[PDB]
Amino acid sequence: VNYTDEETQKRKKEELDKLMEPALGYVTKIPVNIPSVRKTEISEIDTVTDESLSLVPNEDKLRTIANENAGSVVTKSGSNTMNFVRSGYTIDVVHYGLRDKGYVYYKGVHPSKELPKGNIIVYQGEWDFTSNADLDAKRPNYNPEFNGYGAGQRVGVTSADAKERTYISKFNIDFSNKKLNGQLLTKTKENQEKLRYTVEANISGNRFRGKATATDKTDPILGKDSEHLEGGLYGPKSEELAGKFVAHDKSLFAVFSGKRGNDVLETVKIIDASKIDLTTFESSELNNFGNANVLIIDGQKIDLAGADFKNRKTVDINGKTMVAIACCSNLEYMKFGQLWQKEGEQTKDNSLFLQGERTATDKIPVGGNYKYVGTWDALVSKGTNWVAEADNNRESGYRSEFDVNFGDKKVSGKLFDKGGIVPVFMINADIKGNGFTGTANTTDTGFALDSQHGNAVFSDIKVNGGFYGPTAGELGGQFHHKSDNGSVGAVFGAKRQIEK
């Protein structure tokens, strides 16, 4: 007797909803009936957290199985066409019995921090799928589209199993309106195309969420709708996309890719996500999907919101235990703070991070003078270590204060040590697009490293920043420098003010 959990229709939708969380990629195993059951749904759907397009999800696992019984594992990734995404399958084509048949997946790299400015941009690619296994789903003993006897009856049938058919995808992305619509088609030997699915999605950050609608509801395999399509834009300037959808009855799992042509487009920043290493004082990029309140370390997510003003988060990621201090509760569209791996009382790879969701360029104020107030985080190293740790005290704390002139397109900034009545860093920058670039300086003679102890001096250090939120009511930025006469790494964020 086969017993399984009674899943309510509530939980079904909830576990489907869970599949909509953004990730570098997704992979599912092709369902295979155990002898006593008649039907096996798609259910083993896992996120992909590794970041190399060369690695095929769970391929190795399948390969270790393959050789033993028969051997023939085929892999399709679209590596000959795509540069930032991989989609397809890795399967045992000589599969029989109850062992694994393989996996369908998509994955991507460098989630886009820059999108095209506007207009409708075309992306072409491929798609693949696996079905569930169902003896009772009107699937014919002979299939005019799929190789073999009773394809999809005892074992999920895939795009790999099709008779001389290519599975083409086309997408139209309206970057002006952040809408996406597309087609999943099948092309036969005689170049006749058949629309299998239309897709529609809304873009948010570098991700889209939407639905896939089945062209032919009488199709025994590709005939069910999905209200759960999710994917992302990949590559620094949105060169490519990839994604998936799950049929509402878990009877199908599809993956797709897309790549736009060589037309050079104007782009805009939508996301800031970088970290400064506090020993090299170099800046590296972080993966981000357009939610600044979530930190992606090793393809795994860390939530940064909390009840306090700034919040300490401890999260275990691949045996690497990570700790982040994220500020601030009054910042809705950006986060910054410290990040490190913990080793008992030892701490490795200390770094500062900054994340923000850029304001739309056309939503940056064209004129007006506003004050921004926040705090900051920094490390300075000239012999000893001076440090700034974000706080809540507007009066004598680690203050950051900014005068922004949207008319004259300028940012003037002050960064204070605690107690200090005078600033220790003076930021001057010009507003360009939805960001700003400029310089950070100390006074001629600098500031004491606390408290014959050293003085720290920094001249014309490059400052990079952005305006965040719907109408740029938040701003943040960073600067870093390394030399033997001193080194610094700093992140800051500030909220727009109103006279009270």
Side-chain angles (χ1 to χ4, degrees):
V1 42
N2 309 79
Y3 281 135
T4 189
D5 281 351
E6 170 200 290
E7 267 185 1
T8 58
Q9 290 302 312
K10 171 169 188 173
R11 183 175 178 73
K12 272 172 166 38
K13 143 89 166 156
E14 289 177 330
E15 67 183 15
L16 274 178
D17 288 339
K18 178 60 193 309
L19 297 177
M20 299 282 284
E21 228 138 39
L24 290 182
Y26 276 91
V27 62
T28 197
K29 79 152 46 175
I30 301 169
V32 162
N33 291 154
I34 78 182
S36 44
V37 307
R38 309 188 53 85
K39 180 196 209 161
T40 291
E41 294 171 356
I42 317 203
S43 65
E44 298 205 29
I45 301 190
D46 297 333
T47 37
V48 168
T49 59
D50 70 274
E51 210 181 330
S52 71
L53 302 179
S54 40
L55 202 173
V56 175
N58 302 329
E59 180 178 24
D60 40 339
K61 291 81 151 192
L62 218 234
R63 302 215 76 102
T64 55
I65 293 192
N67 37 11
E68 306 196 19
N69 312 49
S72 317
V73 161
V74 187
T75 300
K76 151 167 159 41
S77 61
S79 42
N80 39 321
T81 304
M82 306 299 170
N83 290 311
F84 305 98
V85 304
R86 302 276 178 266
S87 58
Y89 55 84
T90 178
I91 86 173
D92 192 287
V93 278
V94 279
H95 175 270
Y96 65 92
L98 310 177
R99 78 178 184 268
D100 293 345
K101 182 174 159 200
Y103 298 87
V104 176
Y105 78 97
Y106 88 91
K107 79 190 290 181
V109 136
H110 293 323
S112 292
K113 298 218 201 71
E114 302 185 48
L115 312 189
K117 219 163 193 175
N119 304 339
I120 322 272
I121 301 304
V122 166
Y123 292 80
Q124 312 217 23
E126 300 201 2
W127 57 294
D128 292 281
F129 58 87
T130 173
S131 72
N132 67 345
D134 204 348
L135 261 359
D136 299 331
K138 262 116 179 176
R139 293 172 199 174
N141 286 346
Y142 165 85
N143 204 311
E145 174 185 0
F146 297 104
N147 280 314
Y149 179 85
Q153 281 174 9
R154 279 187 152 79
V155 163
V157 62
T158 70
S159 41
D161 299 314
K163 306 180 178 177
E164 285 166 308
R165 278 165 170 88
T166 61
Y167 289 80
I168 294 187
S169 61
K170 295 166 183 170
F171 307 92
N172 301 290
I173 300 195
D174 193 352
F175 287 105
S176 291
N177 290 315
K178 297 202 168 311
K179 304 294 178 193
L180 172 165
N181 58 71
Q183 297 175 321
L184 305 177
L185 316 107
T186 299
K187 180 183 290 188
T188 67
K189 0 136 57 69
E190 316 91 352
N191 283 336
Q192 292 167 341
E193 290 171 351
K194 181 187 179 169
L195 183 59
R196 320 305 301 274
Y197 294 91
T198 61
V199 303
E200 299 177 51
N202 296 319
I203 300 186
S204 183
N206 49 29
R207 312 297 286 188
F208 40 90
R209 305 173 138 245
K211 65 192 181 195
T213 297
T215 285
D216 192 341
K217 258 66 170 189
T218 72
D219 199 311
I221 292 168
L222 300 172
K224 305 280 172 301
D225 288 340
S226 173
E227 303 293 311
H228 288 91
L229 176 149
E230 199 276 342
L233 301 167
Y234 295 88
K237 296 175 161 61
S238 293
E239 291 90 353
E240 294 164 7
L241 69 295
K244 98 219 189 272
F245 68 84
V246 182
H248 71 276
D249 66 340
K250 286 191 172 179
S251 63
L252 194 92
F253 176 96
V255 293
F256 48 84
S257 64
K259 150 178 196 155
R260 65 181 167 85
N262 291 311
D263 302 306
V264 190
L265 318 178
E266 299 168 9
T267 46
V268 290
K269 262 256 188 167
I270 60 154
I271 301 171
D272 280 325
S274 52
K275 75 167 188 297
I276 301 173
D277 188 276
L278 285 190
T279 52
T280 70
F281 296 89
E282 292 295 339
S283 189
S284 58
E285 292 290 351
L286 292 179
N287 288 332
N288 199 267
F289 299 132
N291 182 9
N293 301 276
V294 168
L295 189 57
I296 308 316
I297 297 305
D298 282 340
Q300 312 192 23
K301 97 161 184 164
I302 305 174
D303 277 278
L304 299 184
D308 286 25
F309 176 64
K310 66 172 173 182
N311 308 282
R312 166 193 286 264
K313 288 315 205 311
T314 308
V315 167
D316 214 335
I317 297 181
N318 306 342
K320 261 51 189 177
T321 146
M322 310 294 308
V323 182
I325 310 178
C327 190
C328 327
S329 57
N330 68 325
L331 303 180
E332 297 169 77
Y333 297 94
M334 69 167 298
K335 283 286 178 299
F336 64 92
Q338 321 176 230
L339 175 73
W340 68 80
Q341 180 182 343
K342 191 189 61 177
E343 220 75 21
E345 282 66 15
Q346 294 293 87
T347 56
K348 311 180 168 181
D349 291 17
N350 284 97
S351 48
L352 302 171
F353 71 89
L354 169 72
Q355 287 184 155
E357 314 171 14
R358 291 274 191 110
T359 298
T361 287
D362 63 305
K363 285 281 176 296
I364 307 285
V366 292
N369 290 277
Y370 303 88
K371 178 77 77 177
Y372 287 65
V373 177
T375 164
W376 57 309
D377 277 290
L379 177 67
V380 186
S381 294
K382 184 178 173 174
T384 61
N385 281 350
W386 184 91
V387 119
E389 297 180 351
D391 56 42
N392 207 6
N393 181 236
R394 282 205 184 191
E395 308 306 276
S396 55
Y398 289 96
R399 287 144 290 146
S400 81
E401 299 185 7
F402 298 83
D403 299 272
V404 189
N405 192 356
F406 284 109
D408 293 339
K409 294 188 156 303
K410 291 207 49 57
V411 183
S412 183
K414 301 178 166 186
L415 297 181
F416 296 83
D417 185 4
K418 66 176 307 184
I421 222 56
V422 125
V424 301
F425 277 107
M426 281 72 58
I427 295 169
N428 226 281
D430 307 279
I431 297 181
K432 182 184 181 179
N434 57 17
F436 55 87
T437 295
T439 59
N441 294 273
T442 63
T443 66
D444 322 284
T445 49
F447 64 96
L449 300 182
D450 263 26
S451 241
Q452 201 224 288
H453 304 71
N455 271 111
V457 167
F458 292 115
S459 190
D460 283 328
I461 298 193
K462 173 59 64 64
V463 169
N464 286 292
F467 296 96
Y468 309 124
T471 81
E474 297 174 6
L475 70 80
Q478 71 165 228
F479 60 92
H480 51 86
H481 179 71
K482 170 147 167 45
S483 79
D484 295 347
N485 211 21
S487 296
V488 62
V491 294
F492 55 87
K495 184 79 198 182
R496 199 199 297 147
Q497 306 299 292
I498 54 171
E499 162 76 1
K500 193 179 178 305

